[PDB]
Amino acid sequence: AKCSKGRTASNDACCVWFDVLDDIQENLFDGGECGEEVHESLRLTFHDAIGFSPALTRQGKFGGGGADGSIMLFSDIETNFAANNGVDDIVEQQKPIAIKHQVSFGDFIQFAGAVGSSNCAGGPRIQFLAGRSNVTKPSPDHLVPEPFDSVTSILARMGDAGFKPDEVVALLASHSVAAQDTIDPKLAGHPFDSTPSDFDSQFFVETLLKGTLIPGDSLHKGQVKSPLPGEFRLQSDELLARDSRTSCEWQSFISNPNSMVPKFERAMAKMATLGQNPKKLIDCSEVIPVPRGRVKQPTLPAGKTIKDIEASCRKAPFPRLPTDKGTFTSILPVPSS
């Protein structure tokens, strides 16, 4: 079918998404950037989708509708859950856009995550399906993993929702394009790796370095020491990198960087459809732009060595990586406004 700007699609109902695409690239993402709004949007995909618990359903309680737009439709309720701190911002930015184009909140949330991540260097091209209903109920509280939860707790929660340990590590490739605002607000915008606009393996490398510094005035609930100035480290990411249930897969994105995009794409297609039936939605994947950028060689930061890595996968030694020349430069906070 014929869509705007001479573009075409197999299914006429995908056409509206080219217009949403044009809007959000130009306005929300400031010209196709992989910056704050994209990072916020990719996070919102998980905070909407993970409110899905077959464990609650089996006990005769409402378990949440999954990727259903509930965080947006019932924002007054969900954004005030403890685990949802920091999301009010992007929710309040996205809402009027989805209303304006008259697309469902659940569809919009996954679409902005998929469009946005495609802007990141070396980024993924996430499957995009359309047709989720705006009729749902608010997620139960206590379904979103928090950075001070144990690995056992996180793996049990993710597993209830349908993810294997290897899938959780893959989904955490998102932290390669990510920063925090709410754990230490004085360091709002400090990223989880040295390259928050590149979808690369530096996150998996740098979370394996020994933590040596407190970046702000003190540590805070959910934070641990950082290995590099300007970086921020989450308690959960540190533990997941070293725990025998997840440590080999973590390191596998360093040993085989090419595998990060496909494993992330497959896990996100599943996440994006929690509480949905794909055979009852429509496939609008061709609207998602093709990402640009080569798979980058992972490297050790300037001034670090292999001795600084806490290798944690017993079956397989940490790969030999190049080290950046010279002295390290403090990582910039992610910009903007």
Ligand code: HEM
């Ligand atoms: C597995 C358990 C996870 C935990 C404990 C976790 C924890 C966190 C925390 C604490 C932040 C900082 C929020 C702030 O203070 O601003 C964050 C940021 C982020 N999270 Fe995760 N996350 C997890 C999984 C995921 C998943 C599955 C995704 C998406 C597929 C994701 C995407 C992001 C993104 C893109 C950011 C950057 C947000 C920004 O720059 O404002 N996270 N995460």
Ligand SMILES: [Ca+2]
């Ligand atoms: Ca939801």
Ligand SMILES: [Ca+2]
């Ligand atoms: Ca990165």
